[PDB]
Ligand binder design. Structure first.
Ligand SMILES: CCCCCCCCCCCCCCCCCC(=O)OC[C@H](COP(=O)([O-])OCC(O)COP(=O)([O-])OC[C@@H](COC(=O)CCCCCCCCCCCCCCCCC)OC(=O)CCCCCCCCCCCCCCCCC)OC(=O)CCCCCCCCCCCCCCCCC
Ligand SMILES: CCCCCCCCCCCCCCCCCC(=O)OC[C@H](COP(=O)([O-])OCC(O)COP(=O)([O-])OC[C@@H](COC(=O)CCCCCCCCCCCCCCCCC)OC(=O)CCCCCCCCCCCCCCCCC)OC(=O)CCCCCCCCCCCCCCCCC
Ligand SMILES: CCCCCCCCCCCCCCCCCC(=O)OC[C@H](COP(=O)([O-])OCC(O)COP(=O)([O-])OC[C@@H](COC(=O)CCCCCCCCCCCCCCCCC)OC(=O)CCCCCCCCCCCCCCCCC)OC(=O)CCCCCCCCCCCCCCCCC
Ligand SMILES: CCCCCCCCCCCCCCCCC[C@@H](O)O[C@H](CO[C@H](O)CCCCCCCCCCCCCCC)COP(=O)(O)OCC[N+](C)(C)C
Ligand SMILES: CCCCCCCCCCCCCCCCC[C@@H](O)O[C@H](CO[C@H](O)CCCCCCCCCCCCCCC)COP(=O)(O)OCC[N+](C)(C)C
Ligand SMILES: CCCCCCCCCCCCCCCCC[C@@H](O)O[C@H](CO[C@H](O)CCCCCCCCCCCCCCC)COP(=O)(O)OCC[N+](C)(C)C
Ligand SMILES: CCCCCCCC/C=C\CCCCCCCC(=O)O[C@H](COC(=O)CCCCCCC/C=C/CCCCCCCC)COP(=O)(O)OCCN
Ligand SMILES: Nc1ncnc2c1ncn2[C@@H]1O[C@H](COP(=O)(O)OP(=O)(O)O)[C@@H](O)[C@H]1O
Lengths: 320, 104, 49, 98, 347, 459, 121
């Protein structure tokens, strides 16, 4: 039976599935750090589920089949064009930032839903609470205007206030010159155009605003480049923590019921992302909207409900 | 962005004669266009117009006008021969009408 | 295909289908019987036939 | 009618006006509601006693019970308003307009 | 709020209104009103915020004042006849008290001020409940004592309700305030024909409830509470916009749409007994309601407003919780005009 | 007469169950077949109407209008399948659904035997026309055009409902046969005066009258081609049919009460004919020509003589056909040039000869050339008015002169002269447009061959 | 409300035993057909809202819609006919019971009724 008020009425509660090993874990690191392998190893050792970083086409992997859709139908933005031409006049920068924030919001909703419905913990690679560092980096470098950051702040204020912050935040600290060296050695032709001021603004943002704010609600475990390879040490550090300060031990069954009813129903999660604020970067005209929607509706498995598409081989339609 | 919308450019007119020199101006696909022309012509000019006009031209005289003419001929013949007036002013018999008794 | 279970399965939920079809048939036969009884009572009360 | 009935009705009218005037506070209006109920109770019990209707002697008790329910409701709402604004002033309840 | 507590509060609200509708004693009717208000106050505050708190406060104050006036009317009627049964209510002053108290409970003008504010301050579910279910009990009491009620007082408030509802709805951009002003305008129509024939009142009540239920359920489906927020749903659920446009036309009073049936029947009934001017004024005033419904329809479906980039992500997800009775309410809200003669089953 | 109504309600699901590229063919073919079937109502008894059932009857006045509507739908489908080529399948089906619903309501309107049913369908014709105008228009003024079109009609037709229910409460019935047989004179009182006004003003604003005509230019200019065709051909004749039906109850009040409406109609006919001369737009000129002709029809109905009634019926049919043809002719040029200005594209006779011929024929039939039915109706109305008063001939002759002037002015400006030198996208005329023009114009000549089919019941 | 209070009226019957003396509506009644059509429209709207193939998504659901609408419509029509028959019966009984208020007036022919003539000119 799908979870709802009736499932809550008889039987199913949430606190009887938490086994002290929920521990929503977030790893934050400067561009091109070892946070990915660290998160994977932490998830493997602790037995939690790993959530790879939310990309442009994250929502594509959660619906239909995991195959990503065309950039015109999903995202309408690219990271390569932002690296190559950050000051473009088509508004690609803030469009990309807002789409990535929405994808991170959806991923956080999915992680919370999994944790509440199953009890096994999750290990995210970057949360909605640490997404504003890139926003400040673009704003300080002049990549975006001020109205864009105001719209971002409004959306964040109306969206991120419904969820719970992660139990523990893990930060990987790497100096800017090391980041530049790793970027140069990596090989992708677009990422060597990342200026040093951008990465410096990102890190200034992380230390000054994110970690000081998270230290009031969670536990912060800062590390370094040389101690981010022995994942057994960081796992031992995590499993010897005092989780008594955040709002997580202050949650009753009714609060968990409301949160579980909210994390599912992804439309309710994404409701406030499309507020009627008309910024030139994100506003899309009626004609282009109609054309793109008609194009999306013609996809092989997107015309009807996920069970009523005879195109992708669904049968027994006339009796469902 | 010094603009206000992410708007598609306005498309230019699509000429039906470019990819179809004999278009008939009904559709883009030549076969369905030709058949649309054929059905329009056959059911407008051939069936409805000519057959409908010849059906209307030959409707039976339900308006009772040849009948009215024959009635008039017989009544004129009978009335004139007898010396009676061709037409009578009072449409109804005065005997069957009861006027008010007095007007004072 | 679909990556997720698609709760509407590849076969219909035969329990609900059976319930709906049985409800429809029961309502139809009840309506037929009710109409027959009503017309018989109407014919009896007025003494037509 | 005797003067007692008119005095009770005048008291009810005075309480109703006092409720409808809304000076600054909300406790004042809740007190006006309680006064209206008290006047209704007195009028009802006088009428019932006078006509010797034995059965309706229990009705003013029900009146009092639902008066208490109303008072509890009003007090809870005033508590929440005061927690929101730090003051029970009626001028602060103006977020919604017509 | 716990689901058991919520469902028992809803059942207590329904129990209060049923106690009003099935009781012959005046005291039991007053008790039903009190129970309804007591269990209705927390339902508005299910989603806590300052706006909900002040909406609940205003609603409570208005309903408490109305209950005080109603009980004073009952006591005066008892004073001038030792009778408790809900009947003629011969006494003119007591009848004026009862009529005004029930008008205040209903939202009729000039007591209409509270309705737009409370509707805006509460959620769409609480607004649906308030605008549909909370009209049955006062209307039942009015129908029972309709012969006793004075025509001049009743007519004056109904016409004022229609006028003020139209004029107020002409201005609002928020959907909840539009719905509240439309509710006031419809209350005017229903109480207009009350002294002449209560069957038309019941029929208009049924159709208004159906239309309001359909409109609120469609608004909940496309979770929009403003005009601009509703201007986006053409890019996500065009069928919802088309159905909403048809329902909005029906609400306007246009024929062959069902909404017209209550208006037509009320005009016809009022004409049977030499009331010509009033129906003409009510129709020419309901033109205003039609106008702002039509403006909403222009904003919603008949045109295409610019959308946002993040709607592409909403394109991939389906509405999870589906309303079961929405299609039936839509059909009964639009295509039921040919079944007009079935209104005789209401008397 | 369900043999005509039911095929339309079958046109609906057939349209919705058609293939993506076969909707136009099926709709056109079956609508033409339905019009051929409806051509069978022209057989009318000289004594009384044909009463098929308790709800539907056909008169000599109803049958030409029914045939005109059923013939109109295929032409509207032919004219609409040019600017809708880029539309999706669902919206094309919705457009055809609106057209079919409009035809169904129109068919049920002209044959309803009860006045309240007639009112219900007469007003049900408002929803699809409004949806068409405000959804498939082109400019930003279509919203205001739709609002004007809706509210001018409704604010004048709401009192009609009160008048009708009061009539049924007083006399006891609203069936047209009972109304006509049991009709009684109306005394001279203020109550009866306002009864006259309530019964008349709805159809007056539907004509429209001179003072209440402001909605017509907006609606006819801002609507798409099918909307303009259906507005100017049949939707205007609803008011005339309504007055010709409702006037029986009104006498003897109408003789006394028609002085302001007759005066407005005559002077506004002159005024709108003069307005047509100084028009910079092309569709507005045709709209004002429609206003002038319908004012003439109003005069004919108001003076209320058998010759006036026959002239009114003939003029209604002829104007419907001519105005529809003119609107299509303007729409072809608008599709070529993408503008409505008259003097933009000039000298089109050297580039489109056959369209020049069609323009000439339409303009000739617009200015009442003998022996076309336009002149038959106009001349019968003029003779009836002359019998009414000998001074009306001045106004009628002035109107005829101005009508000829503006018709030939439009024909010369659009067709003669030299081309604009900088419009090089005027492609040769398609077969569809020529076929549409021929299907508009041939019935006019076929009708002037046999004019007794459209002269109404007074024949 | 004229008929709300009537002699010998059971409160919540919805179909008194006296209503069985009237002919039941035929199963092919046009109003029942319209009720079934309303059910079909509701089923189609249900299919459209849930984003399913409108015509052929769920056949059992559409059948249930149609049969429920027809089932309710049968009894609704029965009650409507009963109420109209009851109204006519009461009207005839009242007009018979009070002959002085509904007298039989004289039957004049048009040959002696004088109606004023209004020329059209
Ligand atoms: C003719 C005249 C007809 C009447 C006039 C019109 C009536 C209108 C009624 C308005 C009611 C408002 C409403 O319920 O929401 C409408 C609802 C929309 O609300 P929503 O936002 O989708 O619901 C969110 C939940 O309520 C979120 O709530 P939750 O998750 O906290 O609640 C859990 C859930 C689940 O409930 C349970 O778990 C049941 C547990 C039983 C515990 C028993 C405790 C009591 C005994 C002790 O309970 C409910 O959803 C509401 C239950 C109501 C029961 C009423 C019983 C009578 O849509 C409808 O229900 C249809 C409306 C029309 C109904 C038909 C009307 C004609 C018949
Ligand atoms: C009385 C004459 C006797 C004729 C006997 C037979 C006539 C059969 C005609 C059948 C219906 C005409 C079809 C209309 C559309 C035209 C089709 C077309 O585009 O032609 C291309 C075709 C191919 O040539 P093209 O090289 O491709 O030319 C391309 C350019 O368009 C270049 O084209 P265009 O430069 O050659 O010009 C097109 C031409 C053709 O276009 C038209 O304008 C024809 C329309 C005529 C006037 C329209 C409005 C007036 C209303 C009159 C209503 C009466 C109708 C009678 C029954 C009609 C049956 C359908 O227009 C004209 O030439 C001048 C028009 C001015 C006519 C003035 C006459 C006023 C009334 C006279 C009396 C009428 C009643 C007779 C008895 C009276 C009592 C004894 O050319 C033709 O075949 C022309 C048609 C012959 C001209 C007819 C003019 C007189 C007929 C009047 C009505 C018929 C009376 C029948 C009773 C017998 C006496
Ligand atoms: C009086 C006589 C009868 C007349 C009564 C009235 C008409 C009938 C009753 C009405 C209710 C029935 C159907 C309504 C629900 C359907 C929902 C729908 O959207 O349809 C789409 C659906 C196509 O969807 P699909 O095939 O699944 O794939 C395409 C996707 O859906 C792709 O879809 P999409 O969502 O991507 O497309 C976007 C579109 C989607 O939005 C829509 O499609 C609009 C939905 C219609 C609104 C529903 C209104 C509710 C009913 C009130 C009707 C008012 C009547 C009063 C007159 C005023 C009209 C306003 O939105 C727009 O384009 C926005 C444009 C804005 C235009 C504004 C106009 C909207 C209002 C128009 C209402 C007209 C009346 C309904 C006529 C039928 C329309 C289906 O159409 C159908 O295929 C089913 C239509 C009905 C089938 C009838 C077949 C009957 C049985 C076949 C055999 C016949 C007999 C055989 C036996 C022979 C003996 C051997
Ligand atoms: C392009 C080249 C052009 C030039 C080449 C032309 C070639 C020669 C053609 C010219 C022919 C000359 C015409 C001579 C007249 C002959 C035909 C005429 O005599 O027939 C008339 C017949 O005319 C028809 O009645 C016309 C009927 C009108 C058709 C209706 C239109 C079709 C419906 C389509 C939709 C229209 C919508 C409009 C709503 C009303 C006479 O009617 P009537 O003398 O009495 O009845 C005779 C039969 N009776 C006596 C037994 C009764
Ligand atoms: C833009 C165009 C819109 C449409 C226009 C419609 C026009 C409607 C006007 C109605 C025409 C006549 C109405 C009343 C009939 C007689 C009017 C009057 O001139 O007659 C005199 C009446 O005397 C006075 O004039 C009475 C009328 C004075 C008050 C009415 C107001 C008229 C001023 C103009 C108001 C604007 C009207 C249009 C509103 C937009 C004769 O006196 P008497 O024979 O003893 O009484 C006649 C009536 N009886 C017989 C039933 C008793
Ligand atoms: C506009 C659409 C509205 C539809 C309403 C909902 C339809 C589905 C709901 C199912 C109907 C069942 C409800 C009642 C059935 C059993 C209860 C029965 O005993 O009630 C009795 C009789 O039932 C009801 O009175 C009438 C129910 C019939 C409802 C249909 C009327 C709809 C208006 C006509 C428009 C056509 C609608 C078509 C519907 C699909 C009450 O008699 P009584 O105690 O003496 O009344 C006292 C109060 N009065 C006299 C003042 C009224
Ligand atoms: C595009 C806009 C057009 C607007 C046109 C609107 C004006 C329509 C004309 C008036 C409509 C209302 C008239 C009432 C309908 C008929 C009712 C009737 O016949 O009964 C009359 C009642 O008549 C009235 O009550 C009329 C009252 C009018 C009130 C509203 C007036 C609206 C504006 C007046 C001027 C409009 C007329 C000209 C307008 C021209 C267009 C601008 C007799 O009363 P009884 O009960 O039978 O008693 C008599 C025996 N003792
Ligand atoms: N909010 C954002 N704005 C712009 N770019 C972002 C944002 N979030 C993530 N990215 C991009 O995602 C890329 C991958 O992140 P990173 O962790 O540095 O590489 P890796 O996947 O190897 O760990 C980065 O190049 C970064 O620029």
């Amino acid at each position: 039976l799908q979870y709802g008020p009736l499932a809550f009425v008889l039987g199913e509660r949430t606190t009887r599935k938490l086994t002290e090993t929920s521990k929503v874990i977030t790893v934050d690191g400067n561009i091109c750090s070892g946070k990915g392998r660290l998160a994977r190893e932490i998830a493997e050792k602790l037995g939690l589920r790993h959530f790879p970083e939310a990309g442009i086409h994250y929502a594509d992997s959660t619906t239909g089949d995991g195959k990503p859709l065309d950039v015109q139908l999903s995202g309408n933005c690219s990271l390569e064009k932002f690296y190559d031409d950050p000051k473009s006049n088509d508004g690609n920068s803030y469009r990309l930032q807002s789409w990535l924030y929405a994808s991170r919001l959806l991923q956080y909703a999915d992680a919370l839903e999994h944790l509440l419905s199953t009890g096994q913990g999750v290990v995210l690679e970057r949360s909605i609470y640490s997404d504003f560092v890139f926003l400040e980096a673009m704003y300080r470098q002049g990549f975006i205007r001020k109205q864009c950051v105001e719209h971002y702040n409004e959306v964040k204020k109306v969206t991120a206030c419904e969820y719970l912050p992660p139990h523990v935040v893990v930060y990987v600290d790497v100096p800017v010159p090391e980041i530049q060296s790793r970027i140069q050695k990596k090989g992708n032709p677009h990422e060597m155009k990342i200026t040093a001021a951008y990465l410096q603004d990102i890190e200034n943002a992380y230390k000054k605003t994110f970690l000081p704010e998270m230290s009031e609600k969670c536990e912060v475990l800062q590390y370094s480049a040389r101690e981010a390879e022995d994942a057994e040490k960081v796992v031992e550090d995590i499993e010897y923590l005092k989780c008594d300060k955040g709002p997580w031990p202050d949650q009753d069954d009714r609060t968990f019921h409301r949160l579980r009813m909210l994390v599912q129903n992804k439309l309710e999660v994404l409701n406030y992302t499309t507020i009627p604020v008309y910024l030139p970067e994100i506003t899309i005209g009626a004609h282009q909207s109609d054309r793109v929607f008609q194009k999306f509706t013609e996809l092989p498995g997107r015309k009807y409900s996920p069970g009523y598409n005879e195109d992708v081989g669904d049968k027994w339609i006339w009796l469902k | 962005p010094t603009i206000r919308l992410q708007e598609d450019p306005d498309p230019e007119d699509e000429n039906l004669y470019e990819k179809n020199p004999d278009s008939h101006g009904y559709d883009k696909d030549p076969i369905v266009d030709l058949w649309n022309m054929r059905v329009v012509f056959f059911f407008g000019f051939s069936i409805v117009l000519v057959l409908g006009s010849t059906f209307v031209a030959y409707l039976p005289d339900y308006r009772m006008q040849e009948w009215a003419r024959r009635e008039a001929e017989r009544l004129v013949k009978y009335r004139e021969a007898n010396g009676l007036p061709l037409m009578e002013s009072n449409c109804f018999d005065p005997n069957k009408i009861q006027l008010p008794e007095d007007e004072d | 295909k679909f990556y997720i279970r698609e709760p509407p399965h590849g076969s219909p939920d035969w329990l609900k289908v059976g319930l709906t079809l049985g409800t429809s048939v029961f309502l139809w036969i009840y309506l037929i019987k009710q109409h027959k009884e009503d017309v018989l009572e109407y014919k009896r009360r007025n003494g037509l036939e | 009618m005797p003067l007692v009935y008119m005095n009770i009705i005048m008291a009810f009218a005075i309480a109703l006006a006092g409720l409808l005037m809304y000076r600054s506070h909300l406790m004042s209006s809740l007190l006006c509601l309680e006064g209206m109920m008290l006047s209704l109770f007195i009028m009802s019990t006088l009428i019932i006693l006078n006509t010797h209707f034995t059965l309706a002697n229990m009705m003013p008790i029900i009146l009092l019970v639902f008066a208490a329910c109303e008072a509890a409701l009003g007090l809870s709402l005033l508590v929440m308003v005061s927690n929101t604004y730090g003051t029970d002033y009626v001028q602060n309840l103006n977020l919604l307009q017509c | 709020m716990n689901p058991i507590i919520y469902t028992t509060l809803i059942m207590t609200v329904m129990s209060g209104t049923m106690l009003v509708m099935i009781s012959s004693h005046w005291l039991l009717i007053w008790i039903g009103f009190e129970m309804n208000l007591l269990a209705m106050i927390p339902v508005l505050m299910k989603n806590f915020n300052p706006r909900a708190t002040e909406a609940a406060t205003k609603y409570f104050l208005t309903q408490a004042t109305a209950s005080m006036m109603l009980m004073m009317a009952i006591i005066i009627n008892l004073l001038y006849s030792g009778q408790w049964t809900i009947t003629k209510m011969f006494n003119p002053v007591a009848m004026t008290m009862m009529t005004m108290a029930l008008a205040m409970k209903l939202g009729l003008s000039p007591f209409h001020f509270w309705v737009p504010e409370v509707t805006q301050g509460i959620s769409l579910q609480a607004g649906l409940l308030l605008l549909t279910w909370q009209k049955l009990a006062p209307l039942s009491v009015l129908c029972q004592i309709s012969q006793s009620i004075n025509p001049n007082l009743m007519l004056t408030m109904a016409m004022l309700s229609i006028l003020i509802g139209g004029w107020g709805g002409l201005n609002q951009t928020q959907l909840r305030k539009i719905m509240a002003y439309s509710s006031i305008a419809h209350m005017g129509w229903m109480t207009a024909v009350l002294p002449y024939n209560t069957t038309m009142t019941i029929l208009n009540l049924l159709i208004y409830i159906t239309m309001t239920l359909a409109m609120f359920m469609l608004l909940i489906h496309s979770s929009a509470t403003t005009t601009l927020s509703l201007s986006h749903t053409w890019n996500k659920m065009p069928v919802i916009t088309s159905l909403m446009m048809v329902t909005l036309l029906s609400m306007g009073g246009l024929p062959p749409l069902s909404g017209f049936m209550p208006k037509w029947m009320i005009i016809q009934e009022m004409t049977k007994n030499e009331s010509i001017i009033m129906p003409t004024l009510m129709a020419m005033t309901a033109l205003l309601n039609l106008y702002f419904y039509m403006r909403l329809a222009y904003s919603s479906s008949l045109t295409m407003f610019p959308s946002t980039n993040n709607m592409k992500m909403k394109w991939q997800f389906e509405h999870t919780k589906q309303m079961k009775l929405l299609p039936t309410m839509i059909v009964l809200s639009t295509l039921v005009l040919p079944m007009t003669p079935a209104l005789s089953s209401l008397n | 007469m369900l043999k005509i109504i039911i095929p339309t309600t079958m046109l609906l699901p057939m349209t919705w169950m058609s293939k993506h590229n076969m909707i136009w063919i099926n709709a056109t073919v079956h609508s033409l077949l339905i019009s051929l079937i409806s051509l069978s109502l022209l057989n009318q008894l000289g004594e009384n109407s044909l009463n098929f059932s308790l709800t539907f009857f056909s008169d000599s006045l109803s049958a030409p209008l029914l045939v005109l509507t059923t013939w109109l739908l295929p032409l509207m489908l032919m004219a609409s399948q040019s600017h809708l080529s880029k539309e999706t399948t669902t919206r094309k089906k919705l457009y055809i659904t609106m057209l079919i619903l409009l035809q169904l309501f129109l068919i049920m309107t002209f044959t309803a035997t009860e006045l309240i049913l007639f009112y219900i369908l007469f007003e049900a014709t408002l929803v699809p026309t409004l949806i068409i105008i405000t959804r498939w228009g082109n400019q930003t003024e279509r919203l205001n055009a739709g609002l004007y079109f809706l509210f001018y009609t409704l604010a004048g037709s709401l009192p009609l409902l009160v008048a009708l229910v009061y009539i049924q409460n007083t006399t006891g019935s609203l069936n047209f046969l009972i109304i006509h047989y049991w009709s009684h004179p109306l005394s001279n009182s203020w109550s009866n005066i306002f009864m006259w006004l309530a019964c008349i003003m709805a159809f007056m604003v539907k004509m429209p009258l001179y003072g209440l005509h402001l909605w017509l230019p907006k609606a006819h200019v801002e609507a798409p081609i099918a909307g303009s065709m259906v507005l100017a051909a049949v939707l205007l004749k609803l008011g005339g049919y309504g007055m010709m039906r409702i006037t029986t109850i009104l006498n003897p009040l109408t003789n006394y009460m028609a002085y302001p409406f007759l005066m407005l109609s005559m002077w506004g006919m002159i005024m709108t004919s003069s307005i047509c001369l100084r028009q910079t737009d092309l569709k507005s000129l045709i709209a004002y020509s429609s206003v002038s002709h319908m004012a003439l029809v109003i005069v004919a109905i108001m003076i209320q003589t058998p010759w006036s009634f026959m002239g009114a019926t003939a003029l209604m049919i002829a104007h419907g056909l001519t105005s529809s043809m003119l609107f299509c002719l303007a729409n072809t040029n608008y599709e070529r040039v993408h503008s409505r200005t008259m003097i933009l594209a000039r000298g089109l006779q050297t580039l489109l000869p056959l369209m020049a011929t069609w323009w000439l024929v339409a303009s000739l039939t617009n200015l009442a050339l003998p022996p076309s039915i336009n002149l038959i109706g106009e001349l019968f109305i003029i003779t009836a008015s002359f019998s009414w008063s000998n001074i009306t001939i001045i106004l009628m002759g002035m109107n005829m002169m101005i009508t000829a002037l503006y018709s030939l002015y439009m024909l010369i400006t659009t067709q003669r002269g030299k081309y604009t030198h900088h419009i090089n996208n005027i492609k040769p005329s398609f077969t569809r447009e020529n076929a549409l023009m021929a299907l508009h114009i041939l019935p006019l000549l076929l009708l002037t061959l046999n004019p007794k089919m459209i002269l109404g019941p007074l024949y | 409300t004229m008929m709300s209070g009537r002699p010998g009226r059971v409160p919540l019957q919805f179909l008194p035993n006296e209503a069985r003396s009237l002919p039941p509506p035929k199963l092919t009644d046009p109003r029942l057909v319209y009720m079934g059509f309303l059910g079909y429209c509701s089923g189609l709207i249900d299919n459209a809202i849930r984003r399913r193939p409108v015509v052929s998504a769920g056949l059992h659901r559409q059948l249930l819609y149609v049969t429920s609408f027809v089932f309710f419509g049968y009894y609704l029509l029965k009650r409507q006919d009963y109420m109209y028959a009851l109204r006519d019966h009461d009207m005839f009984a009242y007009v018979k019971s009070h002959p002085e208020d509904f007298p039989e007036k004289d039957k004049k022919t048009y040959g002696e009724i004088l109606e004023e003539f209004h020329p059209v000119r």
